[PDB]
PDB file of C-alpha atoms in Angstrom:
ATOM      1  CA  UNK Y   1       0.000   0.000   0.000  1.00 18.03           C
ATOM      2  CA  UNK Y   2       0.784   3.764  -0.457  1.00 16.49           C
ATOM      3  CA  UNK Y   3       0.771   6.700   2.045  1.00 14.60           C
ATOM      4  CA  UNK Y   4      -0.308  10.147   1.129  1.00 14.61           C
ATOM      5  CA  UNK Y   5       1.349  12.183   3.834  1.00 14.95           C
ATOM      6  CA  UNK Y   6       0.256  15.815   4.691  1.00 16.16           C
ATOM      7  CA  UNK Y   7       1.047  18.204   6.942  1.00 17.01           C
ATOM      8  CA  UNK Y   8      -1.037  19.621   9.419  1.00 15.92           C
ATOM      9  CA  UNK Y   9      -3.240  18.133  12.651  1.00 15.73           C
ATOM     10  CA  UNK Y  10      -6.742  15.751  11.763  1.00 14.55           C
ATOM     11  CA  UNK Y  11      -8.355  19.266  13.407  1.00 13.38           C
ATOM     12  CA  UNK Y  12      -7.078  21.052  10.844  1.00 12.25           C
ATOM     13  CA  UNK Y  13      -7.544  19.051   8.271  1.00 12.67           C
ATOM     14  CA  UNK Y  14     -11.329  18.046   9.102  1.00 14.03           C
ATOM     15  CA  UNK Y  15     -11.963  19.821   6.257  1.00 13.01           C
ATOM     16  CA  UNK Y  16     -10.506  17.638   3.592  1.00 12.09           C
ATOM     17  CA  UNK Y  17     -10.934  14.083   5.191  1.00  8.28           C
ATOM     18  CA  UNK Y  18     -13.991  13.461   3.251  1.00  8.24           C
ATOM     19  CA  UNK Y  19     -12.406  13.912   0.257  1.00  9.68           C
ATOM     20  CA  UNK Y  20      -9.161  11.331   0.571  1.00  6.51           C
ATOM     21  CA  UNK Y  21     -12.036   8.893   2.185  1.00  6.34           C
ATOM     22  CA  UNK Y  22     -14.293   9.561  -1.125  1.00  4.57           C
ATOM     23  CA  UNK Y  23     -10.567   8.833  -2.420  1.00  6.86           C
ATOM     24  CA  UNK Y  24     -10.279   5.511  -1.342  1.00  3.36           C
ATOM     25  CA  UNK Y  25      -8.645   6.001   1.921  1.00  2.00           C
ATOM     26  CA  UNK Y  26      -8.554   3.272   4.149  1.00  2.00           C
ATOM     27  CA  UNK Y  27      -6.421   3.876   6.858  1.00  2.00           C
ATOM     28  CA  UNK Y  28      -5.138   7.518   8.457  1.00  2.00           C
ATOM     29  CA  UNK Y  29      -3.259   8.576  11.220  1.00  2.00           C
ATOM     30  CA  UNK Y  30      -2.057  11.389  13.222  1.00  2.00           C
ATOM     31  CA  UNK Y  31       1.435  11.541  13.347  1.00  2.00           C
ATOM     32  CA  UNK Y  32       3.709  14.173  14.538  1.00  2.00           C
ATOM     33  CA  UNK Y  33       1.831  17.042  12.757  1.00  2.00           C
ATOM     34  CA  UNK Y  34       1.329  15.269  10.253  1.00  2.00           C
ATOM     35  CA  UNK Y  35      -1.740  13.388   8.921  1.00  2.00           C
ATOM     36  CA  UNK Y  36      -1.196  10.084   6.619  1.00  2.00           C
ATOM     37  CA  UNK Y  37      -3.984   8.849   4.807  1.00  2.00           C
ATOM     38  CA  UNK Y  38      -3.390   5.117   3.216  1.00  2.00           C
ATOM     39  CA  UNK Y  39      -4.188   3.750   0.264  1.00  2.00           C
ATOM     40  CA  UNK Y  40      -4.009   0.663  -2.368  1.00  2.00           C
ATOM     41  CA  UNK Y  41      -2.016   2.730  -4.711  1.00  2.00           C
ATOM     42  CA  UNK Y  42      -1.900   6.491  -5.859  1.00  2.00           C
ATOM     43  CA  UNK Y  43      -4.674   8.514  -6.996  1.00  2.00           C
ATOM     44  CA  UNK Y  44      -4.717  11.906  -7.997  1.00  2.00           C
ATOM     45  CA  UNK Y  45      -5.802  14.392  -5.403  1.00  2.00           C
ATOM     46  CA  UNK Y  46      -5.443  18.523  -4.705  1.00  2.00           C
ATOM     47  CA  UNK Y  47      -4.386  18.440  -1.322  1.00  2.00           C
ATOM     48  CA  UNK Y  48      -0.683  18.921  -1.755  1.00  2.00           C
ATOM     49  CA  UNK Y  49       0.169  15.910  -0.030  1.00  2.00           C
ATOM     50  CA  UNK Y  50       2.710  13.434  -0.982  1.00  2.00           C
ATOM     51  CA  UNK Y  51       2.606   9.986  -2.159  1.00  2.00           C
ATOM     52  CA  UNK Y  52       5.325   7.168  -0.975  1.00  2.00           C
ATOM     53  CA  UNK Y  53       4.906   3.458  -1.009  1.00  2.00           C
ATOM     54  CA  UNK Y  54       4.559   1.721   2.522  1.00  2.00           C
ATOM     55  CA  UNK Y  55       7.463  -0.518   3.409  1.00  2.00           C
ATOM     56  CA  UNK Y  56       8.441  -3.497   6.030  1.00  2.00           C
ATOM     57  CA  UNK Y  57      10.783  -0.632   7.573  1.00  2.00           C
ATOM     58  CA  UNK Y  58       7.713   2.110   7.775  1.00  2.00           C
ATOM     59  CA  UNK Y  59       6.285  -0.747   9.847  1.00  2.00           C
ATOM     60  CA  UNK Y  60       8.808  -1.289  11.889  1.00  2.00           C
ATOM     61  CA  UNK Y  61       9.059   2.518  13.205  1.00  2.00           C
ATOM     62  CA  UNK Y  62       4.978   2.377  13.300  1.00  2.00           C
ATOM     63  CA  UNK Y  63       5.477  -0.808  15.486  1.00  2.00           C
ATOM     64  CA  UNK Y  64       8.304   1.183  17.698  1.00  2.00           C
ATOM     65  CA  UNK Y  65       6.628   4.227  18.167  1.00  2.00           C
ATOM     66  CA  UNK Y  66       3.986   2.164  20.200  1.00  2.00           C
ATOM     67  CA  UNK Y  67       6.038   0.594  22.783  1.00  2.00           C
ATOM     68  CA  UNK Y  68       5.842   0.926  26.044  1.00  2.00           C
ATOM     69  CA  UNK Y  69       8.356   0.097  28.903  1.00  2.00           C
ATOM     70  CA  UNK Y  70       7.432  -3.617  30.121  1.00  2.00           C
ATOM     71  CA  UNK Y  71       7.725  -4.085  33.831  1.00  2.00           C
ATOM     72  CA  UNK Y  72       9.710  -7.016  34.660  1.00  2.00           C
ATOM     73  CA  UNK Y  73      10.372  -6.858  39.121  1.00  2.00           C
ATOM     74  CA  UNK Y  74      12.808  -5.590  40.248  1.00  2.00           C
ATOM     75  CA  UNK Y  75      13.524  -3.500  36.471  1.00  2.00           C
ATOM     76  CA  UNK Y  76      11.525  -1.725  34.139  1.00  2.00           C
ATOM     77  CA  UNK Y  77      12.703  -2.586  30.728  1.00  2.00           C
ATOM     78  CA  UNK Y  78      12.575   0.605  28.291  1.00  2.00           C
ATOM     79  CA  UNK Y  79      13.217   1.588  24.803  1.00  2.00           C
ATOM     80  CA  UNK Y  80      16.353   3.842  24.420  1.00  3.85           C
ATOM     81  CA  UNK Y  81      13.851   6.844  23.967  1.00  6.17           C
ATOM     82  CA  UNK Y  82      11.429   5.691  26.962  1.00  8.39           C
ATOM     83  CA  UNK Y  83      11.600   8.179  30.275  1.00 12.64           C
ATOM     84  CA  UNK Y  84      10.736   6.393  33.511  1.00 13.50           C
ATOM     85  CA  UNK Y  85       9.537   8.155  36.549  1.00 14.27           C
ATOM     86  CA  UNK Y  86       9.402   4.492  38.940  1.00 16.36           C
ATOM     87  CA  UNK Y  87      11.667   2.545  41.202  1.00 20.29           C
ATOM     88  CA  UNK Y  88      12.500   0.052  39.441  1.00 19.67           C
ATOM     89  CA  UNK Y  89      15.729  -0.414  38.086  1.00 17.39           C
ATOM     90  CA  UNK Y  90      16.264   0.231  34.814  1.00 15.82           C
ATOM     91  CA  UNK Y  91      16.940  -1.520  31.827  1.00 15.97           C
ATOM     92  CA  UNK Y  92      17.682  -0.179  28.474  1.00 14.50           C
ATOM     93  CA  UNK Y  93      17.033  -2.113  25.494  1.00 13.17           C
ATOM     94  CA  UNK Y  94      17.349  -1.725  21.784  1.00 13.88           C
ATOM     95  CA  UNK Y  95      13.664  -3.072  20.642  1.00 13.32           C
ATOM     96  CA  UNK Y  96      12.165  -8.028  27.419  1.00 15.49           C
ATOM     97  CA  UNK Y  97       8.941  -8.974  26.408  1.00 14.63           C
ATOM     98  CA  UNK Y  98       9.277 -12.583  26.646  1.00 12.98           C
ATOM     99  CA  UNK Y  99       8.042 -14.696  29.403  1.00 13.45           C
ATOM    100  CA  UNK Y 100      10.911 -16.030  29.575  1.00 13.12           C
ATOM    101  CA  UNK Y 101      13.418 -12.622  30.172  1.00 11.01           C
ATOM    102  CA  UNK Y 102      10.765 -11.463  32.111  1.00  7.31           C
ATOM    103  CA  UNK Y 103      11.262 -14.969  34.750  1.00  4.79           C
ATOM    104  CA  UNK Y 104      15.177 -14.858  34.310  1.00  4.28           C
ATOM    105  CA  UNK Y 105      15.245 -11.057  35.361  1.00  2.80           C
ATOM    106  CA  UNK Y 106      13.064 -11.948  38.372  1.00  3.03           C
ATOM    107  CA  UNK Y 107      15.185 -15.078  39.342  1.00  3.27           C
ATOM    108  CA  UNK Y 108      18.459 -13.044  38.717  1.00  2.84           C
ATOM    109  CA  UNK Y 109      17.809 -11.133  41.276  1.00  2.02           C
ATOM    110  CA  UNK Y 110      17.106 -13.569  44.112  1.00  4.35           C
ATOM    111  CA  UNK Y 111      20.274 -15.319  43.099  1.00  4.64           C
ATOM    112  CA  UNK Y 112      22.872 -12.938  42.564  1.00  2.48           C
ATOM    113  CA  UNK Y 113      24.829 -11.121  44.915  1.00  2.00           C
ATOM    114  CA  UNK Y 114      27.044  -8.140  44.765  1.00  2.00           C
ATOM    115  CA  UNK Y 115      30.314  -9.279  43.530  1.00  2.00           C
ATOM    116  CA  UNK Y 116      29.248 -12.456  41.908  1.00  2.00           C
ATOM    117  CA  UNK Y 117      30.750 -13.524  38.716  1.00  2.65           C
ATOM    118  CA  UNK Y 118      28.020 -14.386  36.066  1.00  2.33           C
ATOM    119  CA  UNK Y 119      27.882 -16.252  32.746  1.00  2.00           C
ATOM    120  CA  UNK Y 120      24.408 -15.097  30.459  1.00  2.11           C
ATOM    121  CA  UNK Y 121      24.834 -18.360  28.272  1.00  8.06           C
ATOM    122  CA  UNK Y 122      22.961 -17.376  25.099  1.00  5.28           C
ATOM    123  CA  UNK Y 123      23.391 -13.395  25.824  1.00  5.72           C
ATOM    124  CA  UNK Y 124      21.264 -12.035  22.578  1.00  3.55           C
ATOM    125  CA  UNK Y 125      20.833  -8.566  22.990  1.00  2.00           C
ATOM    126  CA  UNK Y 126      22.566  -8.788  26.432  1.00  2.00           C
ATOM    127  CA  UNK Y 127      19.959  -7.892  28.753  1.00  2.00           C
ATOM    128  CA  UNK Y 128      20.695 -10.171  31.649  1.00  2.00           C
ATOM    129  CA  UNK Y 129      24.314  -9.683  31.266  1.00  2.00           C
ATOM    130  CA  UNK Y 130      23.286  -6.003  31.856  1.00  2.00           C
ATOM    131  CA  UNK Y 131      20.854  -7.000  34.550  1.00  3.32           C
ATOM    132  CA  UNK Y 132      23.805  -8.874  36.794  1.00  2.86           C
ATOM    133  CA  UNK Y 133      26.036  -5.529  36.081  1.00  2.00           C
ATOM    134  CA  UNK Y 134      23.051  -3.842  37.375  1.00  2.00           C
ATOM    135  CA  UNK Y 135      22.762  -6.220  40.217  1.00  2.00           C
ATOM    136  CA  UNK Y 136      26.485  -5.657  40.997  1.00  2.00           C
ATOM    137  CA  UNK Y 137      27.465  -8.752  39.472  1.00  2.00           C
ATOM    138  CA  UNK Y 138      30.501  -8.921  37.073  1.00  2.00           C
ATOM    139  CA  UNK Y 139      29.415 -10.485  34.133  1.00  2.00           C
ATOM    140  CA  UNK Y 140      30.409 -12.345  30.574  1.00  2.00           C
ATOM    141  CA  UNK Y 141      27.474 -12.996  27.967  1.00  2.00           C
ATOM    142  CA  UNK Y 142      28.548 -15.323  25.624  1.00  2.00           C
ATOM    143  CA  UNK Y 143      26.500 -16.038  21.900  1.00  2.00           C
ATOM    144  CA  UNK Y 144      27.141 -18.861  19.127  1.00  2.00           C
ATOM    145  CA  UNK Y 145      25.994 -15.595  16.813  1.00  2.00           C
ATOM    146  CA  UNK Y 146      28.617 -12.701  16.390  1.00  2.00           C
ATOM    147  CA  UNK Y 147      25.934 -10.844  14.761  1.00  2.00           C
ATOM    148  CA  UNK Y 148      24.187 -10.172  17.847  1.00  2.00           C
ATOM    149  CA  UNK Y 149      27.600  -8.943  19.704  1.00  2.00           C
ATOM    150  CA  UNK Y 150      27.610  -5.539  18.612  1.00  2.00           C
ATOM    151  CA  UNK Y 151      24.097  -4.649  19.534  1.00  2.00           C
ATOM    152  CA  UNK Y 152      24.472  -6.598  23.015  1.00  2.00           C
ATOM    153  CA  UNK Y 153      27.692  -3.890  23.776  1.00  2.00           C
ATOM    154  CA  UNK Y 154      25.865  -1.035  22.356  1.00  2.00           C
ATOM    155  CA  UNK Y 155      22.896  -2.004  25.074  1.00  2.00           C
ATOM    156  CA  UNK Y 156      25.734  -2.234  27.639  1.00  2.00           C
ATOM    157  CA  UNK Y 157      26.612   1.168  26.953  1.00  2.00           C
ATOM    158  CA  UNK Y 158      23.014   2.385  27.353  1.00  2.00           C
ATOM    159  CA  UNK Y 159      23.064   1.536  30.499  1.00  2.00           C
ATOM    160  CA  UNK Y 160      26.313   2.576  31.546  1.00  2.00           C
ATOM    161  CA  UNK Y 161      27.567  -0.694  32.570  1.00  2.00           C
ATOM    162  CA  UNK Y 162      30.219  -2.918  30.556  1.00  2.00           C
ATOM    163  CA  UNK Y 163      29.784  -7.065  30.814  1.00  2.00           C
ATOM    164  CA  UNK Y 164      32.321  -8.754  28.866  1.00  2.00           C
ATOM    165  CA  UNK Y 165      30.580  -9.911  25.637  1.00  2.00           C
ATOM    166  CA  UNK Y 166      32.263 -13.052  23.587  1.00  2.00           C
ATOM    167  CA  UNK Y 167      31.088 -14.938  20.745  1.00  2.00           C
ATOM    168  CA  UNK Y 168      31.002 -18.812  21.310  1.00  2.00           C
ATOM    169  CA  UNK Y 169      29.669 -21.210  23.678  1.00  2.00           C
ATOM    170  CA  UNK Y 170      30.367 -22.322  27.091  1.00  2.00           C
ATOM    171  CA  UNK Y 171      33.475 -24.358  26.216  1.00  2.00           C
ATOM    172  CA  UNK Y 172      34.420 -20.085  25.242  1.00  2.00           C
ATOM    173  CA  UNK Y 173      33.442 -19.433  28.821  1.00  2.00           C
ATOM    174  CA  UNK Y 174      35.584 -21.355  30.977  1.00  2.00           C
ATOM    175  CA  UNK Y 175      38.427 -19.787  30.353  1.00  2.00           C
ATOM    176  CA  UNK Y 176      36.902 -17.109  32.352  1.00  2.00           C
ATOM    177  CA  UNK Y 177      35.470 -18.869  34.459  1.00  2.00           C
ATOM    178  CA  UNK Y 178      34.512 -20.786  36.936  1.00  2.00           C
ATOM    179  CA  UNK Y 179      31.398 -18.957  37.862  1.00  2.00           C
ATOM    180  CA  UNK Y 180      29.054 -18.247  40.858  1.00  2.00           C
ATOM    181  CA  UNK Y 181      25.346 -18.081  38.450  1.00  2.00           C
ATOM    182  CA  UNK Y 182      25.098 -18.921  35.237  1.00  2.00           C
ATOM    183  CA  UNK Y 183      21.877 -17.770  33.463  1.00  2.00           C
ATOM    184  CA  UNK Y 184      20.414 -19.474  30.440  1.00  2.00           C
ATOM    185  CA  UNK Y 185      17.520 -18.738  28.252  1.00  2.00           C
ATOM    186  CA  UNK Y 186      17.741 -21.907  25.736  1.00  2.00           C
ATOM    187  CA  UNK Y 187      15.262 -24.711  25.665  1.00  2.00           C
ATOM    188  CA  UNK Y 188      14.584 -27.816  27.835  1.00  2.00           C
ATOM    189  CA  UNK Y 189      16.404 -30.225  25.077  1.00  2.00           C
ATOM    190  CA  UNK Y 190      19.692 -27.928  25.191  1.00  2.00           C
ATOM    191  CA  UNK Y 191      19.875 -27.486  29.322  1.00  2.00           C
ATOM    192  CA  UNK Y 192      19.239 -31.287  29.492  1.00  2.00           C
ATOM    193  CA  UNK Y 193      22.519 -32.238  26.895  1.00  2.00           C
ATOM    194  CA  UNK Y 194      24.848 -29.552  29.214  1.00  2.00           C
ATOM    195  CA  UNK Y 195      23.736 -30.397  32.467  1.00  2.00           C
ATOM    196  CA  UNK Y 196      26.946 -31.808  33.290  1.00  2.00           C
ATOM    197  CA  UNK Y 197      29.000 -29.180  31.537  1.00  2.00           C
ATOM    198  CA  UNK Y 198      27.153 -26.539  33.725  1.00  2.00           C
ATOM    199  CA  UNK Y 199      28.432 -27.981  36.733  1.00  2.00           C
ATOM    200  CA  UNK Y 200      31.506 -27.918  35.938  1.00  2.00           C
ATOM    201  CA  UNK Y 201      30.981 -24.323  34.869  1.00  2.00           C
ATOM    202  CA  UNK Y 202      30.292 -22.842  38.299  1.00  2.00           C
ATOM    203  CA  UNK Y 203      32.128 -23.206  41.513  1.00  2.00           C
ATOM    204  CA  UNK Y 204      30.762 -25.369  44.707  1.00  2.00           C
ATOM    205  CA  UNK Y 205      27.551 -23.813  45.881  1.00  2.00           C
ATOM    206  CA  UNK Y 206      27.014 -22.194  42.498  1.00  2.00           C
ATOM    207  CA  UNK Y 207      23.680 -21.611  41.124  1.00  2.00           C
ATOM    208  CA  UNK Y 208      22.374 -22.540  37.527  1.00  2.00           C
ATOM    209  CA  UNK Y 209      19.070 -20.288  36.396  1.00  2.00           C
ATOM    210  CA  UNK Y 210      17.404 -21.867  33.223  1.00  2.00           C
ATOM    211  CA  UNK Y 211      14.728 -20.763  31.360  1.00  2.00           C
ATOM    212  CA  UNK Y 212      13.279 -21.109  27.675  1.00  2.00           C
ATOM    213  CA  UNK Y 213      11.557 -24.413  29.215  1.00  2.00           C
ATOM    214  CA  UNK Y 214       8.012 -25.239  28.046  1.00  2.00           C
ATOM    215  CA  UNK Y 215       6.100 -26.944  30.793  1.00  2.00           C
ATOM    216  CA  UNK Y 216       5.605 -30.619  29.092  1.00  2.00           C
ATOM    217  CA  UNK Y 217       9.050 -30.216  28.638  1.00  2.00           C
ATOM    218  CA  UNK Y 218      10.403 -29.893  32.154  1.00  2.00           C
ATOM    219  CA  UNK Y 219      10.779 -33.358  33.393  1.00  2.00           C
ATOM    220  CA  UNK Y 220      14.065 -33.687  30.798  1.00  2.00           C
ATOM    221  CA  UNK Y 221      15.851 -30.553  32.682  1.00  2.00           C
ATOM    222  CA  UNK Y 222      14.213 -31.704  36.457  1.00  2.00           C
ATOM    223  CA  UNK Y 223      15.775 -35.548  35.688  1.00  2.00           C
ATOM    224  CA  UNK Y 224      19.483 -33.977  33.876  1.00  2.00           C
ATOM    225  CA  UNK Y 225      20.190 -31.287  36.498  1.00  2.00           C
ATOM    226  CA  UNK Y 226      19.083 -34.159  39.087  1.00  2.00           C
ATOM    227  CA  UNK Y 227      21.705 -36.499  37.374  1.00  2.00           C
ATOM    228  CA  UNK Y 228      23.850 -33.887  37.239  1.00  2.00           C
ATOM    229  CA  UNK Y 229      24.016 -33.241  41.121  1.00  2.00           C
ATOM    230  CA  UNK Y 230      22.385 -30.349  41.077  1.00  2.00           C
ATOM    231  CA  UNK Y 231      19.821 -29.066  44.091  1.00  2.00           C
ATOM    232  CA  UNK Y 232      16.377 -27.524  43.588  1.00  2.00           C
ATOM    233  CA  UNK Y 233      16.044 -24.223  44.499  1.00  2.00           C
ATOM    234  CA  UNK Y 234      13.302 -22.327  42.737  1.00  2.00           C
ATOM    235  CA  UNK Y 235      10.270 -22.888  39.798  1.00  2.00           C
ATOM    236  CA  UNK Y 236       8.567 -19.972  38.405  1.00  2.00           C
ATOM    237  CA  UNK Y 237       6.571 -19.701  35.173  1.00  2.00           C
ATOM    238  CA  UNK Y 238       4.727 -17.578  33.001  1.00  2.00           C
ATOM    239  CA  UNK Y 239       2.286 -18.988  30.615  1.00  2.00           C
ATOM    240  CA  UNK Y 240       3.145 -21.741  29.286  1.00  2.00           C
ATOM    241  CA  UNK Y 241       7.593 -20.998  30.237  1.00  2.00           C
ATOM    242  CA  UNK Y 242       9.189 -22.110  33.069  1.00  2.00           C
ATOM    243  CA  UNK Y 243      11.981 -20.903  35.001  1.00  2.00           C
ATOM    244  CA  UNK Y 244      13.659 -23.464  36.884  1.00  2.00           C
ATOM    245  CA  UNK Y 245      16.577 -22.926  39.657  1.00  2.00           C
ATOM    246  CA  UNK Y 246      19.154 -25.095  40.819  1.00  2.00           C
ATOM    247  CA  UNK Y 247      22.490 -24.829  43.483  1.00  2.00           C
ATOM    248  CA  UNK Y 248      25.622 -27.007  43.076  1.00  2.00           C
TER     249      UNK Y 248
END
C-alpha cells in the first residue's frame, strides 16, 4: 500500500478528510503534525500531499513508536527513547517482552549477589548480562551468533555498565570462568545435553538459572540437572515458560 502524507493536525484538516475517504482512503493517522492517509495505490488528489509506497521498515518505526516500557520486578525494561519516573531499576534495550526474560530477570535477582561472577549463556541482545552488572554482578554474555555482539555492547553502553561480551559457547566461557550463576535462556532439550557441563561451569555452591523451558518439557531438565548433582532451588513460570533454579 501507499501513504499520502500531509502536513497539518486531523483538526485542521477536518476539512478535507472526506475527500481522501471519497478517495479511497482506508487507513489515516495522526502523526507528529502530520496526517497520513493510506491507500491501495496512488490517486490523484489537490491536497498537496505526498505519495510514498509503505514498506516493512515504515512498519517497523509504526510498530516502535507504540512501545511501552514492560515491567519485569525488580527493572523496568525501556526503549532507548522511553523516560521512567518508577523505582524500578532500569533496563535499556534496543527493541524483554518474553516470558521467559521477564522470569530470568526476576530469578536473577534472588540469586545474585554483589560481587558475583556471572555467565548469560545465550546473551542475545545482552539484557541479563546487563541486569547482573546492574545487580552488581561482574558479568560475561557469551552467543554462538557474532551478529548479535555488537548490539548486546551497544545495550551495555546504554546503560552505563560494561559485561564482557564473547562470541562462542560455554566451552568459550571457561576460560573465564569458573562462575558463581550462570543464566540461560535456551530450551529444555539444550539445558538437558549440558547439564553436566554446567556444573563444571560454576564453583561449589554455584547456582544454575534456566529458562526457555516449556512446561511438558520440564521433566528432561528436572531428571538432567538431578543427574547432574544439582539441588532444587526455585520454579517460576509464566504462561506456558518455566523458570527453573538449581544450586551445586
Amino acid at each position: 500500500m501507499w501513504v499520502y502524507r500531509l502536513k497539518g493536525t486531523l483538526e485542521a484538516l477536518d476539512p478535507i478528510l472526506p475527500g481522501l475517504f471519497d478517495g479511497g482512503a482506508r487507513g489515516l493517522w495522526e502523526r507528529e503534525g502530520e496526517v497520513w492517509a493510506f491507500f491501495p495505490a496512488p490517486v490523484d488528489l489537490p491536497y498537496e500531499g505526498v505519495w510514498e509506497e509503505v514498506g516493512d521498515e515504515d512498519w517497523l518505526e509504526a510498530w516502535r513508536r507504540d512501545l511501552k516500557p514492560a515491567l519485569a520486578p525488580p527493572f523496568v525494561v525501556l526503549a532507548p527513547w522511553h523516560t521512567w519516573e518508577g523505582a524500578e531499576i532500569p533496563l535499556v534495550i534496543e527493541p524483554g517482552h518474553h516470558e521467559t526474560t521477564r522470569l530470568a530477570l526476576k530469578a536473577l535477582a534472588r540469586h545474585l549477589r554483589p560481587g558475583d561472577k556471572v555467565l548469560d549463556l545465550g546473551t542475545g541482545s545482552g539484557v541479563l548480562a546487563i541486569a547482573a552488572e546492574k545487580l552488581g554482578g561482574k558479568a560475561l554474555g557469551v552467543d554462538i551468533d557474532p551478529m548479535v555482539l555488537p548490539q548486546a555492547e551497544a545495550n551495555a553502553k546504554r546503560n552505563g555498565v560494561r559485561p564482557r561480551f564473547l562470541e562462542g559457547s560455554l566451552e568459550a566461557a571457561l576460560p573465564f570462568g569458573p562462575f558463581d550463576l550462570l543464566v540461560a535462556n535456551l530450551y529444555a532439550e539444550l539445558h538437558a545435553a549440558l547439564a553436566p557441563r554446567y556444573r563444571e561451569a560454576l564453583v561449589p555452591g554455584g547456582r544454575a538459572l534456566l529458562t526457555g523451558i516449556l512446561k511438558d518439557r520440564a521433566p528432561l531438565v528436572r531428571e538432567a540437572m538431578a543427574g547432574a548433582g544439582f539441588r532444587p532451588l526455585e520454579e517460576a513460570a509464566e504462561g506456558e515458560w518455566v523458570l527453573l533454579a538449581y544450586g551445586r
